[PDB]
PDB file of C-alpha atoms (C1' of nucleotides) in Angstrom:
ATOM      1  CA  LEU X   1      75.621 140.108 -21.751  1.00  0.00           C
ATOM      2  CA  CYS X   2      76.324 136.490 -21.012  1.00  0.00           C
ATOM      3  CA  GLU X   3      77.318 137.431 -17.383  1.00  0.00           C
ATOM      4  CA  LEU X   4      73.649 138.195 -16.379  1.00  0.00           C
ATOM      5  CA  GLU X   5      72.109 135.334 -18.777  1.00  0.00           C
ATOM      6  CA  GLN X   6      74.183 133.101 -16.685  1.00  0.00           C
ATOM      7  CA  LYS X   7      73.765 134.248 -13.276  1.00  0.00           C
ATOM      8  CA  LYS X   8      69.954 134.524 -13.794  1.00  0.00           C
ATOM      9  CA  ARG X   9      69.447 130.779 -14.927  1.00  0.00           C
ATOM     10  CA  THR X  10      71.167 129.835 -11.803  1.00  0.00           C
ATOM     11  CA  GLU X  11      68.545 131.257  -9.709  1.00  0.00           C
ATOM     12  CA  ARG X  12      65.887 129.658 -11.430  1.00  0.00           C
ATOM     13  CA  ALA X  13      67.431 126.400 -11.040  1.00  0.00           C
ATOM     14  CA  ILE X  14      68.062 126.569  -7.326  1.00  0.00           C
ATOM     15  CA  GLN X  15      64.364 127.368  -6.313  1.00  0.00           C
ATOM     16  CA  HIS X  16      63.008 125.057  -8.871  1.00  0.00           C
ATOM     17  CA  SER X  17      65.424 122.189  -7.071  1.00  0.00           C
ATOM     18  CA  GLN X  18      64.171 123.266  -3.802  1.00  0.00           C
ATOM     19  CA  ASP X  19      60.370 122.620  -4.443  1.00  0.00           C
ATOM     20  CA  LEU X  20      61.149 119.476  -5.896  1.00  0.00           C
ATOM     21  CA  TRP X  21      63.077 117.970  -3.277  1.00  0.00           C
ATOM     22  CA  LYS X  22      60.388 119.063  -0.598  1.00  0.00           C
ATOM     23  CA  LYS X  23      57.618 117.322  -2.357  1.00  0.00           C
ATOM     24  CA  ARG X  24      59.618 114.158  -3.019  1.00  0.00           C
ATOM     25  CA  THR X  25      60.301 113.305   0.640  1.00  0.00           C
ATOM     26  CA  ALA X  26      56.974 114.779   1.874  1.00  0.00           C
ATOM     27  CA  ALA X  27      55.362 111.652  -0.156  1.00  0.00           C
ATOM     28  CA  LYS X  28      57.479 109.237   1.336  1.00  0.00           C
ATOM     29  CA  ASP X  29      56.929 110.317   4.989  1.00  0.00           C
ATOM     30  CA  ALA X  30      53.241 109.575   4.761  1.00  0.00           C
ATOM     31  CA  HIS X  31      53.755 106.150   3.289  1.00  0.00           C
ATOM     32  CA  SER X  32      56.136 104.864   6.209  1.00  0.00           C
ATOM     33  CA  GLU X  33      53.389 106.057   8.817  1.00  0.00           C
ATOM     34  CA  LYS X  34      50.374 104.091   7.732  1.00  0.00           C
ATOM     35  CA  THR X  35      49.105 100.379   8.292  1.00  0.00           C
ATOM     36  CA  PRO X  36      50.500  98.266   5.455  1.00  0.00           C
ATOM     37  CA  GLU X  37      47.610  97.174   2.894  1.00  0.00           C
ATOM     38  CA  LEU X  38      46.638  93.400   3.231  1.00  0.00           C
ATOM     39  CA  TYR X  39      45.618  91.896  -0.188  1.00  0.00           C
ATOM     40  CA  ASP X  40      42.070  90.577  -0.051  1.00  0.00           C
ATOM     41  CA  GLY X  41      41.168  90.089  -3.924  1.00  0.00           C
ATOM     42  CA  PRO X  42      40.815  86.910  -5.839  1.00  0.00           C
ATOM     43  CA  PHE X  43      43.638  84.383  -5.690  1.00  0.00           C
ATOM     44  CA  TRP X  44      46.089  83.726  -8.468  1.00  0.00           C
ATOM     45  CA  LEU X  45      44.726  79.907  -8.994  1.00  0.00           C
ATOM     46  CA  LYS X  46      44.282  80.125 -12.947  1.00  0.00           C
ATOM     47  CA  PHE X  47      47.892  82.162 -13.473  1.00  0.00           C
ATOM     48  CA  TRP X  48      49.840  78.968 -12.623  1.00  0.00           C
ATOM     49  CA  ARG X  49      49.707  77.002 -15.481  1.00  0.00           C
ATOM     50  CA  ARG X  50      50.854  78.367 -19.181  1.00  0.00           C
ATOM     51  CA  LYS X  51      50.424  77.776 -22.661  1.00  0.00           C
ATOM     52  CA  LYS X  52      53.618  78.768 -24.714  1.00  0.00           C
ATOM     53  CA  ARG X  53      54.118  78.202 -28.283  1.00  0.00           C
ATOM     54  CA  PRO X  54      53.366  74.992 -29.562  1.00  0.00           C
ATOM     55  CA  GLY X  55      55.991  72.602 -30.996  1.00  0.00           C
ATOM     56  CA  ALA X  56      59.622  73.658 -31.539  1.00  0.00           C
TER      57      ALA X  56
ATOM     58  C1'   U I   1      42.107  71.887   8.641  1.00  0.00           C
ATOM     59  C1'   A I   2      39.679  75.945  16.372  1.00  0.00           C
ATOM     60  C1'   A I   3      44.189  76.761  20.802  1.00  0.00           C
ATOM     61  C1'   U I   4      50.084  76.694  21.898  1.00  0.00           C
ATOM     62  C1'   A I   5      55.848  76.207  20.489  1.00  0.00           C
ATOM     63  C1'   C I   6      60.027  76.051  16.195  1.00  0.00           C
ATOM     64  C1'   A I   7      61.253  77.855  11.246  1.00  0.00           C
ATOM     65  C1'   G I   8      59.896  78.720   5.791  1.00  0.00           C
ATOM     66  C1'   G I   9      57.002  80.906   1.421  1.00  0.00           C
ATOM     67  C1'   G I  10      53.840  85.086  -0.940  1.00  0.00           C
ATOM     68  C1'   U I  11      51.509  90.919  -0.788  1.00  0.00           C
ATOM     69  C1'   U I  12      52.385  96.189   0.608  1.00  0.00           C
ATOM     70  C1'   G I  13      55.647 100.528   3.149  1.00  0.00           C
ATOM     71  C1'   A I  14      60.935 102.703   4.283  1.00  0.00           C
ATOM     72  C1'   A I  15      66.209 102.213   4.294  1.00  0.00           C
ATOM     73  C1'   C I  16      70.326  99.776   2.057  1.00  0.00           C
ATOM     74  C1'   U I  17      72.727  97.714  -2.217  1.00  0.00           C
ATOM     75  C1'   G I  18      74.475  99.633  -7.561  1.00  0.00           C
ATOM     76  C1'   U I  19      74.636  94.031 -13.299  1.00  0.00           C
ATOM     77  C1'   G I  20      74.167  90.536  -8.152  1.00  0.00           C
ATOM     78  C1'   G I  21      72.373  86.771 -13.953  1.00  0.00           C
ATOM     79  C1'   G I  22      69.726  82.296 -17.688  1.00  0.00           C
ATOM     80  C1'   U I  23      70.887  76.511 -18.554  1.00  0.00           C
ATOM     81  C1'   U I  24      73.226  72.791 -15.600  1.00  0.00           C
ATOM     82  C1'   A I  25      77.955  66.401 -13.889  1.00  0.00           C
ATOM     83  C1'   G I  26      82.394  62.657 -12.696  1.00  0.00           C
ATOM     84  C1'   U I  27      77.208  66.145  -7.937  1.00  0.00           C
ATOM     85  C1'   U I  28      73.454  66.350  -3.865  1.00  0.00           C
ATOM     86  C1'   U I  29      67.741  65.871  -0.693  1.00  0.00           C
ATOM     87  C1'   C I  30      62.986  64.684  -1.052  1.00  0.00           C
ATOM     88  C1'   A I  31      59.479  61.500  -3.901  1.00  0.00           C
ATOM     89  C1'   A I  32      52.283  57.277  -3.896  1.00  0.00           C
ATOM     90  C1'   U I  33      51.468  51.871  -4.049  1.00  0.00           C
ATOM     91  C1'   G I  34      53.975  47.257  -3.607  1.00  0.00           C
ATOM     92  C1'   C I  35      58.336  43.523  -1.492  1.00  0.00           C
ATOM     93  C1'   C I  36      62.443  42.067   2.454  1.00  0.00           C
ATOM     94  C1'   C I  37      63.252  43.278   7.782  1.00  0.00           C
ATOM     95  C1'   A I  38      61.813  45.353  12.101  1.00  0.00           C
ATOM     96  C1'   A I  39      58.115  47.262  15.482  1.00  0.00           C
ATOM     97  C1'   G I  40      53.943  45.486  16.541  1.00  0.00           C
ATOM     98  C1'   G I  41      47.944  43.431  18.507  1.00  0.00           C
ATOM     99  C1'   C I  42      42.482  43.496  21.678  1.00  0.00           C
ATOM    100  C1'   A I  43      38.418  48.776  16.333  1.00  0.00           C
ATOM    101  C1'   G I  44      36.295  49.579  10.923  1.00  0.00           C
ATOM    102  C1'   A I  45      37.914  46.143   5.904  1.00  0.00           C
ATOM    103  C1'   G I  46      39.964  41.584   3.102  1.00  0.00           C
ATOM    104  C1'   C I  47      43.898  38.256  -1.107  1.00  0.00           C
ATOM    105  C1'   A I  48      45.243  32.987  -0.567  1.00  0.00           C
ATOM    106  C1'   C I  49      41.682  29.346   1.545  1.00  0.00           C
ATOM    107  C1'   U I  50      35.715  23.217   0.462  1.00  0.00           C
ATOM    108  C1'   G I  51      31.568  26.898   2.615  1.00  0.00           C
ATOM    109  C1'   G I  52      25.317  27.055  -0.737  1.00  0.00           C
ATOM    110  C1'   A I  53      24.439  27.805  -5.753  1.00  0.00           C
ATOM    111  C1'   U I  54      24.484  27.731 -10.739  1.00  0.00           C
ATOM    112  C1'   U I  55      23.479  28.347 -16.666  1.00  0.00           C
ATOM    113  C1'   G I  56      21.141  27.202 -23.114  1.00  0.00           C
ATOM    114  C1'   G I  57      27.109  23.024 -19.869  1.00  0.00           C
ATOM    115  C1'   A I  58      30.652  24.369 -16.799  1.00  0.00           C
ATOM    116  C1'   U I  59      32.421  28.680 -11.992  1.00  0.00           C
ATOM    117  C1'   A I  60      36.192  33.680  -8.753  1.00  0.00           C
ATOM    118  C1'   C I  61      29.782  38.071 -10.576  1.00  0.00           C
ATOM    119  C1'   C I  62      25.989  37.745  -5.992  1.00  0.00           C
ATOM    120  C1'   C I  63      26.253  36.517   1.087  1.00  0.00           C
ATOM    121  C1'   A I  64      29.174  35.056   5.345  1.00  0.00           C
ATOM    122  C1'   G I  65      33.979  33.111   7.778  1.00  0.00           C
ATOM    123  C1'   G I  66      39.044  34.169   6.798  1.00  0.00           C
ATOM    124  C1'   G I  67      46.434  34.106  10.988  1.00  0.00           C
ATOM    125  C1'   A I  68      49.424  38.465   4.658  1.00  0.00           C
ATOM    126  C1'   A I  69      49.316  43.646   3.622  1.00  0.00           C
ATOM    127  C1'   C I  70      47.484  49.150   6.341  1.00  0.00           C
ATOM    128  C1'   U I  71      51.294  54.549  11.275  1.00  0.00           C
ATOM    129  C1'   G I  72      58.596  53.210   9.915  1.00  0.00           C
ATOM    130  C1'   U I  73      63.886  59.312  10.902  1.00  0.00           C
ATOM    131  C1'   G I  74      65.852  52.459   7.612  1.00  0.00           C
ATOM    132  C1'   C I  75      66.494  49.629   2.825  1.00  0.00           C
ATOM    133  C1'   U I  76      64.294  52.266  -1.711  1.00  0.00           C
ATOM    134  C1'   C I  77      62.140  55.204  -7.506  1.00  0.00           C
ATOM    135  C1'   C I  78      59.834  49.783 -11.706  1.00  0.00           C
ATOM    136  C1'   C I  79      54.597  53.374 -13.245  1.00  0.00           C
ATOM    137  C1'   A I  80      49.350  56.247 -16.846  1.00  0.00           C
ATOM    138  C1'   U I  81      56.324  59.998 -12.995  1.00  0.00           C
ATOM    139  C1'   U I  82      52.279  64.381  -8.531  1.00  0.00           C
ATOM    140  C1'   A I  83      49.283  71.848 -10.975  1.00  0.00           C
ATOM    141  C1'   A I  84      48.255  70.732 -18.708  1.00  0.00           C
ATOM    142  C1'   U I  85      52.479  69.090 -24.012  1.00  0.00           C
ATOM    143  C1'   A I  86      59.097  74.740 -23.117  1.00  0.00           C
ATOM    144  C1'   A I  87      63.291  76.213 -18.002  1.00  0.00           C
ATOM    145  C1'   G I  88      64.794  81.530 -20.110  1.00  0.00           C
ATOM    146  C1'   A I  89      64.130  87.058 -23.282  1.00  0.00           C
ATOM    147  C1'   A I  90      61.041  90.444 -26.453  1.00  0.00           C
ATOM    148  C1'   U I  91      55.722  92.077 -29.113  1.00  0.00           C
ATOM    149  C1'   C I  92      49.875  93.802 -25.452  1.00  0.00           C
TER     150        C I  92
END
RNA sequence: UAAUACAGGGUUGAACUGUGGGUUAGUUUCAAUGCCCAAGGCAGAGCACUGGAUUGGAUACCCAGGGAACUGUGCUCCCAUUAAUAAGAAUC
């Protein structure tokens, strides 16, 4: 009984891993083939100064 | 603070790396204005200085002239000392 349970479990993992790797690399390929996005939003002029805990 | 040359910082994409760190002297750069020295000049401005006003008893307020001070690879940090009054980690 244990021989069949272990053998079947191995096949399920092999197929699942193959599909996961295929999609993982597909996304990275697209990112490395497009023009970088240049930021054009509001500047960070108010985030410079902070107000931490007063006193000690 | 349009053009061009040299070299930094910030945002995003891939690869690599696989705990590399926080604070910091017997330490080291930079640092407005003023002053000594030096280089200087032919513009726009003005401290000192007899150059036209004072008073209800005293004056630099209101014009004009006016040879110091205003670009430094230097000596150099006294101040109301340059983007708040904490250099870091955790709770969204």
